[model samples]
Structure formats: C-alpha cells, structure tokens
Target: APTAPSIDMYGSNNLQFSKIELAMETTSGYNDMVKYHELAKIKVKFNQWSGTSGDTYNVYFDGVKVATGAITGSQTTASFEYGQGGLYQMEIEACDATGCSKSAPVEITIADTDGSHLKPLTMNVDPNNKSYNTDPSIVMGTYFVEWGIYGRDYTVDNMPVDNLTHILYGFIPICGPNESVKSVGGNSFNALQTACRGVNDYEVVIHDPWAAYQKSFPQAGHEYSTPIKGNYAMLMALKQRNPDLKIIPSIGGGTLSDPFYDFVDKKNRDTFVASVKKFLKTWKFYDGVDIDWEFPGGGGAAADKGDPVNDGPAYIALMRELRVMLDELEAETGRTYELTSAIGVGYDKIEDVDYADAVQYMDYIFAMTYDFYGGWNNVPGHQTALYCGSFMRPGQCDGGGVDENGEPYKGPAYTADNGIQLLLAQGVPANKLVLGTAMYGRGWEGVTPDTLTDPNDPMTGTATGKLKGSTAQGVWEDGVIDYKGIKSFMLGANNTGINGFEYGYDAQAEAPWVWNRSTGELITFDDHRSVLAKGNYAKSLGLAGLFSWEIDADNGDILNAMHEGMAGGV
Candidate 1:
C-alpha cells in the first residue's frame, strides 16, 4: 500500500488563517433572461474532529441562526455554513437523558452581500503569545546549534554549545524563496545567532540561510535535490564561518520521502549511491550524511516498498555501499564521511529489514521518539511521555483501521520512547540510539466537563459537568483551534461553559489527559514534566543522547529537560 502523506503541521495548533469569503449566488426569478435578486451563499468548512455520537449542533451566521443539527460524530464533516453578510458563531450541545450541555465560541465576519465589500482582517491574538521566561545560564549541552536562527527572541547569547561540547545549526529545507527568516537582521536568523554565538563543536542543518543556492537550481530532480542545493551554500557558509562546525546533509522529512527506490533499484542502485557521494564531495564541507527516511515499511503515508521480503536487506546494502565509498573518499580528503539514518518507531521494519546489518555501516541512529500523539488521532494525549508514567486519552478512532478490536482506542499508548524500547529489545546497541523530543504539544476539540463524564468517555455514559462536543453555534471555525491559541481563548473573560482539558488517566493504559469544560476542548500536551519523564526513559534505556525535533517550539525548558533527562542529569 502507498504511504499516507504527512501534513506539515506548525504553530501552536497547526492552523492557518484562511480568508472567510462572502459571495452571492444569484438566480433569476423569471427563469432565463430576467434580472432577479441575489441570495448570499456563505460557503464554509473548518477543520473537523470527532465528538459524542448523536449530538445536536447549532450555527449562527451573521447574527441569524442558520442551522442546528446532529453530529454524525466524524472529524471529516464537522464544519457548517450560513448566509453572507452577518456575524458568525456556533453552539454545540451533546446530551444523554440527564441533560449534559457544552458550548463553543467562534469568530467570523459578515459584511455587504457583495464580495468586494469584505475587508481584510487578521486575527489579533489577545495578550499576544506569552512565552515561558527562560534564563540561559541554566542551560547545558555540548553541540549548541542554532535552530532555524532562534537566539535573539530569547535571552540566550548563543546556542551555548561552545561552552559545553558540540553545537548544531538547524536548517529549514522548505523555508522559502524569501530571506526574511535568514536575513542578517531578520528576527529568525538573529534569534538563532543569539543562541548559537559561542557554542563549540558546531554542526549546521542547512535550511534557509543562503538563498542564492536555491536560485537557478534544477527545477526538478530527485525528491531532495532542490532542498540540498538550496541549502548547499549555507552549509558551506556555516562551515567557513565557524570552521569547527561539522556540516552534514540530512535527507528526507515530513515534506518529502526517501525515493531511494527511484535511485536504488537493482538497475541503478550503485549509480544512485555514487551520485550521492559526488554531491557530498562537490560540497567539500560535509562531515557525514543524515538519512531521515521517515519510515521504510511502517504504516506511514510516505513509505514505499523496495524488495518486499528483502527490503530490510536492501536498506543494509545501501548503507554498506555508502560506508565503503565514504571510506575511500576519506582516504583522499582526510575527513571522515559518516552515515546515519532516522530509526522508526514501529517494528514493521525491524521485522522485515536487516537492521543489524545496517547498523554495522552506520554511526548513530537518530531515533524519532516523538509523534506518539497528534491531531490526526482526533483524541487528546501527550506528544511525548515522561519516564515514570503518562496519562493519555485512548485513540479516538476505532481500532478497526489496524486491529479488529472494533472500539475507539483511548491513548496513553506506548509512544516513541516505547519505540526506543522496541529497538533495544531488538538488540540495537545503546550508543547507536538517540531519543527524540518535541517542542510542541497535542490537543482535542469538543471537550467539556458536562459532556465528558469519565473525562475519558463522556459520551458513552452520564458524566455531569463534562463537555463532550463543541457548543459553538456552527458559525465559527470549529476545527481550526490549536493547543496554543486555545490557551489564549481560555484565559479571557469569555472563558466559561468552555473547558480546555479534563485531567484524565487510563491507569491500565498508563496515560493522562485534561478536560475543557466550556467548548469541550480537551488537550494532552507534553510539558517539561513529561519531557523529563522522556529523558528519564532515555536514561533507563541507557541511550546515547536526546535530540529535539526543534528548539523554538515552546518558550519553555522542555527542550533542556529532554537533554538533561537523557544525560540522566545535566
């Protein structure tokens, strides 16, 4: 089966403000040639989420109540529509005999029925985004790499790697044709410089810093060609700027997959490896190659089949070829060419691939121990788990997709840290394993105390003061809310009848969740506490180190905690 593609989720909630367009669909009362009045059709669709089955939903568009209907209980068909030129909002209510109610507030615009009358409006967040104040002096680590240029915005003078051991320079492959993020005075670049200024053992992941490399590069090539070239000069520049920074090219990401099959089929396997080596040499500054093959045979959207039964063997073969070439290249260049690949969380590959063989040719395997919980699940849970234990809501969707269990699987399931456990159990050495940390959190909608009884399952049983669905009147974007903005919405004067998280736990499952009373917006976020748990988990696993997916996700010390926890102490 073809891999399901992953979305490039960003921001606190992974939502972008798309225009709420107001247009009129006119029809002639006189049938054909006669002029007639126009009727406004406000087409609207917001991100959807699952809720208690058989709940009534009401929508008010432009001050006029449009529709109040039942929730079929699916995440795909949640948003509603109304007439043009009026205020918009939604109210969702779910009940089971004993009267449980929940409501959500939605913001929408209305103007003249004419399309041109609408003006541009940017949703101004109240109180802006409050960041957790951090003191850099407390930070510790070796490789102090700047993350997509993230130092200035915070108090850190640099990545603080030089004062410790090594430093990392983060690069965004698909950042942009614009230099705003990478520009010298630009906030993004300046911010990164602030944190990475004095770090030693610098290594940069090429992203947006050097724009020239992107220009005139091939309009098409392999999946990763454009990004590698776009950031090549930046890689070169970073190496030159610090001289000590190790530059390595990381391939494949959520944006794209490893089309290794396209280049590594029996017909062109050697050719593909040679071309990759050539690219490394031409750049002249890279110390190694980082292959982020999101997954090989796992159930991801991007995975593709190689030699099916021998797919694992195929991966080993490719890595072996690269190592041999790197050894030859090292003899002449005097610089070691290292090789690494991102390890998968699911055992699908471990069962099918020759992981032991691949490890023989590779250096450290950066394990992606994140994404245990996310919006895709349509249920609330942490993105990462602490070592001690966690409380997560079960998977919202029924287990029918993968298992025939035929019931919604509430989470607090094994996360990627569990993935590390799988790898360890499979005999992958500790030094080769690196635990992953997320700079973000996870959330859910339609979470309220009145509707949510168990805070785990409010719909199935009578739970007072639990909110199970959106009370939103159906006029607002019910599905676009994210974890960060939800916090902003809850701290205001209108923060009633709306609950955010339901502090829930599945002890048998060993997971945690929180309930939101008002709009029934439940969220499961990974906090410093959870990260510390993850760090402890890494330590318990006796792993090499902890690598964070990003450094700029939250304005907190979770990132530092993961680092410290992995080291078992900073």
Candidate 2:
C-alpha cells in the first residue's frame, strides 16, 4: 500500500469502510523521494467502489483541478502537497491502460492540525422547544420559512416585522421556483440592523444545499458536479444582510440526503469536512453548521451505507470534527463560531443522533414536531397538537376509537408525548431541545356536525369531509392561499369541513388540537389556546423554548400565548 493518506467522505450513497475488503498488492519499487514543492506536493488516495471497475482519477481542490493519474485492478496510490487548506474533490473514472472511461465523483477534506481540537461556547438556553419569551434579549432566533429566501432581504418591511423577534431564512418546497434571496441583487441583505433595531436577530438556516445540489444535475434532485458551486450568491446575500447573523447551513430535511449513511465515510470524511470549511471561509457568512438528518432508521428510500446502526456514532464523529474546525476558526479569526442541528419529532431520532454527543457539542437542537399528521397519516389529524387526544376531549387513541387518557373519546386521536418523550429518551438535555409549532393543522372528515360549535370539535361546518391535506401543501405553489388569503378563507362560507375540521383537546393532557387550518380554506389550525397548553407542558418538562415554523401564520396573538404558557398560565 502506498502509505495511504488520511481522508473523509461525505455525500449521498458514500462507501462503507467495513463492507469493502481493502488490501495491499504492491508492484512499484522504492522510487527516490522526488521533491514536488514547486509542483504542489499534496497527500491523497483513491476511492473506488467494489461495485465499480475503474482506473485513472482526477483531483480537485476548492473547485480547481490540480492533477490527474491512473489506478488499475492492481496497485493505486498518489501523494502531493498543496499550498491551501480547504475542501477538495478526488474524482475517479474507469479506464484501461490506454486511458478513457466512466466518471464517479466523491468529496473529502485535509485538515490535520487545521481541524484539530477546539471548544464551543454553549448557549445557556434552548431556542427550539421554548414555551415562552421569544425575544432577542432572551434568546436569538429566526423564523423557519421556505419563503422570502428569493425575493426580499429579510428586513422589517418584508419579514414579520411587528411580532417577530427574528427571521430564519431557508428555501421553498420545490427546488426550481424563483425562491432565492440571491435573485434580488444581493442588496436585500444590506439592511439587516436598520429594519429591526434591537427587536430581533437573524439566523440563516441553509436550504441552498438542495438547490445547489439540484443545480448540479437537471435530471437528478440532489447531485452536485465534481466541483460543487457552494451558492456564493446566497452567501453574499446573508453577509450583506447582517455581518453578525448566526448563519449556519443545515443538512437534511424532507428531500435531503444523509451524508453519514450515503456519502460520508472514514476514507473521505476529512475531505468532505474540508470542503464545507472552505465554503464557510470563502463565504465568510455562516458562523456554524447545522445537521438536519430527517431520519436515520426511518427513511425507507434514502439510506446510505451503515445507516440506522452507525447513524448515532457517525453523526457524533461529524460533530466532533465540526466542533474542532469551528473552534479553530474562531481562535484564528477572533469571531465566535457555533454548531446547531434541527432534529426529528422525538426520542427515536435522538437515539440516531447520539444525543449524548450532539448535545455536548451543539448550541441547540431544533425539534421538528410539525407534521404530526399530514398526508403521511392513514387517518386525518392535526400536524401539531398540544396533547395527544381525540377530536373531542383529545388525549390518546385506543384501538378503534380515541380517548382522553382514561375517558373514551368519540373522535380520532394523536399524541403530544411522542415528540417530547423521544428527545428526552435519547438523552438530549432539557435546555438544548426546542419544540416546534405549526401555524396550520391537518385533518380528514367522516363525522357529523354541520357547523363548528366547540373549537375542539372534530365535526362542524359544511361537512364536506374533504380529508387528507397539508397547510404548506395547500398554499405554497399549487394552492391559491397566501398569508393574506388565509384571512379570507377563515371568514368564507366554505371554511368548515365534514366532521367540522376534526380536532381534539385534552385538558389533563394539556394540549389542544386542530386540523391545521389554511388561510384560503379553514383546515384545523393550532391556536394560542392549544399552543398555550403545549407551552405550559414544555415548561413543566423543563424545556428551553418554543419554536414556530414561520411567523407568517401567527397573527401576533400566538406569540403572546407562548409568553403566557411559559409563565404557567399567569
């Protein structure tokens, strides 16, 4: 073996170190040590899948190709030294002795001392699951929205200025629309502090990975070319908006790929980490990194190698490296760096993330408990609820019927405990978890009431029984409702549904439910009352704080409710 150089792999469907058997079969004799300091002497190795047959490979550093060489079924090794330290790509293509073949790409990093030991300054509070006081003075925050990323610079005029403490900028659902803030001449970000003086803060939650990854291949949803163009436009925009914003690129969501399972591995993990570090340095915007692996054990279609099992340890290792890099960067630059992650609904996900390791390194864990029941459900229900219950005195679902803990409920059921229990079980510190709230709800219809009498009634209104829908799904691209459109929908004649927007409430459970209402047409939505219940519950749970997907859905009242809830109904 040509004294193998250290590397790390990160991307979708990455190689599994243990799966492929690696050995040394040397042929080349001890060639005299050739000095290539002028020619760029960098140390690197080859990444060939056992499933593939290849030879010559090309290497790239920070998007620039530096060299090319050959590797056959026999021996393969190359070593060089480069001037800079950042992300680099080692691409391999199948070829014969004459050359010419197939192309397969992978990412890796080289940061021996550059990415060594470092420490993170822990935020004393949890920004995601907080039950009250979402102001800048209390905790820095941003609205998690897929909109406003393209057109407006997140300022007081375009964002939820009045009620919002800050704006969390990301991407829209689909990748191709004009949903990038980068399109607006990047000047949109120029006025970050002027718009909201002391009232709010900013955090850029990266959704560009999906867009940039998609841009790499027109036919593929997430595939970047050998040289990744780390969305410089968006990065510049964020820097323009606020030089001090806590910008972090989060990986993973509904459509995101798990680098740990798919693309990242011991062989090239360092290389991948180096690439990300390069992006941050080049952009000079993001203060940290946020890992949002939608699921480790649950993803049926998108698993990489060694998923669900090494999921925890892999993530832990990733964090360890990121922590080191960020700490080093801070020490070198004198600017504080941060690391955060958006987690799944509960403890199950926590287990996959190696909670003990993540909580120690990360600044916060944003708990996504939103789509509790949207289209993915067999039955209709709310995407978010305060407590698990039925359409009536909601609590828990018991077999064919739902119930309020002990009492048999007449309506369907859901659980609020799933989100909380899952995180705590995974050993996530109480202060690090942030519970999420959806401004809208989800539902189906099969009940009776022709009109809504009780807010928690599952049966009310027109009784159309039009079940199976989502708030985001209804109004984003296909749906005709905007924030302004929702108000019109709530007052319309066709606002209610069959079973009256089926909703459940459990006073003892201390959570409320709604169908997650949309503005154009009333779906069941979680109101201040329901959020109040959950907020109080979070406080009881010793949670950090409350987090909402977007401020657009809230009409200010809910923010007040969050404050009251955390104060124990005072």
Residues 1-570, model 2: lDDT tens digits: 122222333321132111111111211111111011212234444444453335455555444666667666433454545554334455544454465443344444332211111111112221332343444433234454433333321222233332333334443111111112223344322222222222211111223332321123221111331222223223333344445445455544444333345333554456556655654654444566666655655552243333667766767777788788888888877988777776665444544556766679887777776665543332344556655544433244433544435645533344556666766766778877776766544444433343444544443333333443334433543212222224334323343323323334445444443344332123445565677776766777777677666655444455556666666743
lDDT of 1 by residue, 1-570 (tens): 111111222311222121221111221111121111223333333322343443444444334556555444332133443333333454334444445443444544432211122222112222322333332322222222233232222211223222221233333222111222343333544433333333211112233322313322232121221122222333343343345444455654543332443433654457546655654544455577766654555354432333445456667777888798889888976876668776556444455665666788987787766565455544444445532132322342211232225644432234564556567666778777766665434555554555433544532222222122232321112232223233334323332323343344434322344445555555444444556665665567566666664433333344445554544533
Cα RMSD for predicted model 1: 27.1
For model 2, state the Cα shift of residue 268 in Å: 4.6
- The local lDDT score (0 to 100) that residue 106 gets in candidate 1 is 52
Query: Weakest 10 consecutive residues, lDDT, candidate 2?
Result: 27-36
Candidate 2 local lDDT, residue 415: 51
The lDDT of model 1 is: 0.43
Best TM-score goes to which candidate? Answer: 2
Q: By TM-score, how accurate is candidate 1?
A: 0.52
Query: Which portions of model 1 miss their true places by more than 4 Å?
Result: 1-245, 303-308, 386-413, 450-453, 456-515, 554-556, 566-570
